[PDB]
Amino acid sequence: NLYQFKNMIQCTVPSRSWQDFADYGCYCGKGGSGTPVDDLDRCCQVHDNCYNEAENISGCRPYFKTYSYECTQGTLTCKGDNNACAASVCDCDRLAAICFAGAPYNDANYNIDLKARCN
Ligand SMILES: [Ca+2]
């Protein structure tokens, strides 16, 4: 769920406030369309697409599904007790969190005008 994803981000990128990734480019947060503006945005595009794919699973609601995971000593792990939905969503979140940690953060790309720039 989003709370868990927030925690994944807090654990792979403790140097930023989680909310720095909640409204960035065309895909991080709200958004879900247009040209990814940079590598961080591309991380979010893959994440968004990953969620859309997980939503094909019956009863699978990525913002809400509580999965089983651990963030310890620099590593994120999706646990074996996860059903197909939980495993898929956890993987989406894990990969995105790792992606965020390796992407440059451009302040100019925070809170961009989606209606104008993400068509
Ligand atoms: Ca999004």
74 is in an annotated binding site: no
Question: DSSP letter string over 6-40?
Answer: HHHHHHH-TTS-GGGGSEETTTEES---S---SHH
Joined tokens for residue 114: 């989606």
Q: Which CATH superfamily is domain 1-119 in?
A: Phospholipase A2 domain (1.20.90.10)
Domain ranges for the chain, please list them. 1-119
The catalytic position among 20, 23, 47, 91 is 47
User: Do 36 and 27 touch, CB atoms closer than 8 A?
Assistant: yes
- Is 91 exposed, middle or buried (CB count within 10 Å of its CB: 0-12, 13-18, 19+)? middle
Given a contact cutoff of 8 angstroms between Cβ atoms, the answer to whether 93 and 83 are in contact is: no
Q: Which helix (H) or strand (E) holds 2?
A: helix 2-12
Which distant-in-sequence residues (6+ apart) come within 8 Å of 118 by Cβ? 26, 31, 33, 34, 35, 112
Instruction: Collapse the DSSP code of 115 into the 3-class scheme (helix H, G, I; strand E, B; otherwise coil) and give the result.
Output: helix
**Buried b / exposed e across 38-76, counting CB within 10 Å, b at 16+?**
bebbbbbbbbbebbeebbebeebebeebebebebeeeeb
Q: How many residues does the chain have?
A: 119
47 is catalytic: yes
**Token pair of 107, please?**
């302040």
**23, 93, 107, 113: which is the annotated catalytic residue?**
93
* Helix (H), strand (E), coil (C) string for 39-106: HHHHHHHHHHHHHHHHCCCCCCCCCCCCCCEEEECCEEEECCCCCHHHHHHHHHHHHHHHHHHHCCCC
Q: Quick one: resolution in A?
A: 1.5
